[PDB]
Design a protein around this nucleic acid. Structure first.
Ligand SMILES: [Mg+2]
Ligand SMILES: [Mg+2]
Ligand SMILES: [Mg+2]
Ligand SMILES: [Mg+2]
Ligand SMILES: [Mg+2]
Ligand SMILES: [Mg+2]
Ligand SMILES: [Mg+2]
Ligand SMILES: [Mg+2]
Ligand SMILES: [Mg+2]
Ligand SMILES: [Mg+2]
Ligand SMILES: [Mg+2]
Ligand SMILES: [Mg+2]
Ligand SMILES: [Mg+2]
Ligand SMILES: [Mg+2]
Ligand SMILES: [Mg+2]
Ligand SMILES: [Mg+2]
Ligand SMILES: [Mg+2]
Ligand SMILES: [Mg+2]
Ligand SMILES: [Mg+2]
Ligand SMILES: [Mg+2]
Ligand SMILES: [Mg+2]
Ligand SMILES: [Mg+2]
Ligand SMILES: [Mg+2]
Ligand SMILES: [Mg+2]
Lengths: 77, 50
RNA sequence: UAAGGUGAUAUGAACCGUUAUAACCGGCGAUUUCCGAAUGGGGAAACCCAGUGUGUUUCGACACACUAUCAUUAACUGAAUCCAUAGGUUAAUGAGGCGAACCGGGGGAACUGAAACAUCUAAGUACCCCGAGGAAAAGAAAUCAACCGAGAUUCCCCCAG
RNA sequence: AGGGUGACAGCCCCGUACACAAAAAUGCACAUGCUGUGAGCUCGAUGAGUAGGGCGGGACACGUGGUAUCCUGUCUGAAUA
RNA sequence: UUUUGUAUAAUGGGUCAGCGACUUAUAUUCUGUAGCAAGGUUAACCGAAUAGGGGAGCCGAAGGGAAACCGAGUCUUAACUGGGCGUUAAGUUGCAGGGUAUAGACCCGAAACCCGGUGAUCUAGCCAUGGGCAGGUUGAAGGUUGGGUAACACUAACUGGAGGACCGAACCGACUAAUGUUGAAAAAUUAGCGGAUGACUUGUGGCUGGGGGUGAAAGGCCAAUCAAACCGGGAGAUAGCU
RNA sequence: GUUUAUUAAAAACACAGCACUGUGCAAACACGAAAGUGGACGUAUACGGUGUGACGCCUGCCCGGUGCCGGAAGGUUAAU
RNA sequence: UUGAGCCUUGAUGGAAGUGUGGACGCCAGUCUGCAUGGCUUUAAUGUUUGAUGUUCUAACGUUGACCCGUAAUCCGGGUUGCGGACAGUGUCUGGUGGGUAGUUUGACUGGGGCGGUC
RNA sequence: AGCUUGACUGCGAGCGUGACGGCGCGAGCAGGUGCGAAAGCAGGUCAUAGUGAUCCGGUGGUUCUGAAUGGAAGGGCCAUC
């Protein structure tokens, strides 16, 4: 599924609206990517299906923390 | 993404400076290649003691 | 508790009981074929076939027990790669399916109304889905007030069509 | 109260008011035993990819309207008594 | 019943019996009636539970002006000789009724739109694996041997056995007619007719699903249903019509 | 040969043949939120789409309109 | 190669001898330097930043090859070749869009349509 | 033909005409103005066609309103598109 393994971001439904405001169902879905991440603390690469932001989080909090989560939460990975 | 260096490296190499690198440059090459590391405000003290 | 009983259509047969092991009622046990989440594999539900263990002064073949999957934990094992991982076996736990409404959540119509119809309405309704409890949810102010003050959430009547 | 009995029964029957009863198993309260759990004082700490913003939607009675406020798909991003 | 008008040859009714259509709730206003009266009445809730408590509140006693504001006046204008709305009549809460609002709002009736399901045991096409075609014709390529060429060509016999080839049963079709039309039959019977070694025909089993399938194409077929299947749901859709 | 099972078997559909056009393969194209699958265990003498319809003799003029192909200039033009 | 600011390689509120091209100089200075003599436009070095072109690998692709899980044309891991900041995807955005959907398409009227009328 | 801005602002007894929205006629009062010696006349044109409700919004004016308070936004009112 199109779920960001870091943020839990998933597709959400909203509307389209024309210039005449005609509503047509639609979905916003996240900017997923799947990415080889180096951990070093395990001498290995791990591919997380990750959103940008998911990346920007990993940048900030730093991988291992994020990996504490997921494992804390049960995410396969 | 400021990070601190480790070896020489590019037009910023210095064995331990606070640069401001582009993130992709950072978290895809330098760190996985061990040529820098994030400056997590804890890291800005170990290479700010020398 | 008891003088009468062996459910009903439902007589009959053969019985059982009367001062306490007749029946009947209640509490707790016992037995509880096969199918069905079905869980040993399969399958046209109630059937076919196994591996391993047990079992026979007639120790063959049959009968019985156990063997699904996932999760967590442990143990033992263990590639590419030596380390280490993935992988593999066993084990202990828990899950699975069903069920009236109420409840929270993910999705979410059109008829219809506008005396037509797009915005708007019907309506976050119907419906699909996931989940849980005896209730659910909500909740201990980054809330209101208006310079006076109030003091979580929830429900009822007002405020007011 | 009510039902039944060969027609309409306080006194025929079964009940009713009322007073009583549990060998066992259980719901609920307390009281403790066992397991798991933490209490207490001193000194600290005070929730950042967040608040806010841009784009797109959605929620708030409120249709973007002069539109506060809330939620976030997207790109951003503080102060810290 | 409907109509300008119906014995009407315009509708409806074979007959009887039973059932079958202006309701309910909450708001609002009017009439009646009752209580009290410049006042009337409580809502939830408490409850010794139709009591009693509870006056939060609602209506009325003041109007005028968009409003600030003023007030038996006020607004208009610089200002009214003025003018507009007001100042004189009582209100309010129950109970019964007439209207209206919101609801299915007097009852029955669509063709349809949306949602979730069930259907390829009919039929369309396709996949896989098995089966069928009496009898009789025609005589393609090729072959052989003579003739014939310099050798080929070519030619005659004989041989060979081609084809969405021929005639014709089984089998598959459905051109004509009559019969049948409350059938023998919700599509057949009889006499004739087409194909009949092929793009043939057939048994079993499989796959394709509803704005979707399949279609040698007719809008054909998708279970006697098809210009959007069937079942349940929204649902008492809506019906200015009968 | 096929067709409106059940009022139309035909001059309709199909057909071999013809032409245009797309497609360089992870093909175009189709089913599919996606994974994937068909196209094809094929590869331009292939495959899809469209029109025409054995064969014979042939298929003339018009690119202004609409469409398609090509066009690194300039004018106008979105978020930002 | 190259757009554009602040720092920078440009200018402002040992005298005199030998004296020669350029100056947007309406329309050409025997004047200055070459060895020697008691806080900018005419443009370019360090940057923070776009446009284009080359190169690289390290995100990302691989429906090439080999290895292991594993007797497995799925997936994953691994090595490697190829591709490579492209491709693809998310959000936003201009174009196209009967492929698909919802709808509109007046009334009068000597029937209706066409005409005419409003 | 001369001079001119009465094609004026606030009002309006009383009427006509419309289902209504509305439209029309009007002496007179107040302020200020023109022509006339003056009485006077003038609130557009000899009259009856020359037109468009509401909503949304623009503009100018306006101490009327201003979501704690001062402001402001926005609104109202007057004029106008
Ligand atoms: Mg079984
Ligand atoms: Mg099984
Ligand atoms: Mg309508
Ligand atoms: Mg205080
Ligand atoms: Mg805090
Ligand atoms: Mg008539
Ligand atoms: Mg009549
Ligand atoms: Mg008569
Ligand atoms: Mg008659
Ligand atoms: Mg009649
Ligand atoms: Mg079939
Ligand atoms: Mg034949
Ligand atoms: Mg024949
Ligand atoms: Mg049928
Ligand atoms: Mg109906
Ligand atoms: Mg409805
Ligand atoms: Mg027919
Ligand atoms: Mg026929
Ligand atoms: Mg072709
Ligand atoms: Mg033809
Ligand atoms: Mg359409
Ligand atoms: Mg509609
Ligand atoms: Mg008409
Ligand atoms: Mg405020």
């Amino acid at each position: 599924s199109r779920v960001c393994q870091v943020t839990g971001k998933r597709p959400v439904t909203g509307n389209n609206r024309s210039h005449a405001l005609n509503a047509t169902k639609r979905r916003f879905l996240p900017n997923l990517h799947s990415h080889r991440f180096w951990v070093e603390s395990e001498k290995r690469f791990v591919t997380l299906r990750v959103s940008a932001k998911g990346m920007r989080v990993i940048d900030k909090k730093g991988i291992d923390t994020v990996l504490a989560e997921l494992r804390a939460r049960g995410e396969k990975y | 993404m400021q990070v601190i260096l480790l070896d020489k490296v590019a037009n910023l190499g210095s064995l331990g400076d606070q640069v401001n690198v582009k993130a992709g440059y950072a978290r895809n090459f330098l760190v996985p290649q061990g040529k820098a590391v994030p400056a997590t405000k804890k890291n800005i003290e170990f290479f700010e003691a020398r």
